[PDB]
């Protein structure tokens, strides 16, 4: 709640997700501009664990995403957050091996 800490990570390309039924796909397709592009994160010297780093990143970046998202007067159904979830949760672990060297 006090911010700070965070670096923003270069965007990148949504993934085709599938959901495992023909309403989710449908509904994913048609909603997903609505969901991050990219990511919230607190260095990998914070973090002894990709595991963890993750959980970092997505919940941080989905609360912050629905503040910006109330402003625009428009609400998320309980769907929104289950999909919101996943691909940020992809898109951390991109971000996650962004250092191999």
């Given at each position: 709640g006090g911010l700070g800490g965070y670096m923003l990570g270069s965007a990148m390309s949504r993934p085709l997700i599938h959901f495992g039924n023909d309403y989710e796909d449908r509904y994913y397709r048609e909603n997903?501009?609505?969901?991050?592009?990219q990511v919230y994160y607190r260095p990998v010297?914070?973090?002894?664990?990709q595991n963890t780093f993750v959980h970092d990143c997505v919940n941080i970046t989905v609360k912050q995403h629905t503040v910006t998202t109330t402003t625009k007067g428009e609400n998320f159904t309980e769907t929104d957050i289950k999909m919101m979830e996943r691909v940020v949760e992809q898109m951390c672990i991109t971000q996650y091996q962004r250092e191999s060297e």
């Open positions: 997903m501009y609505r969901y991050p592009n010297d914070q973090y002894n664990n």
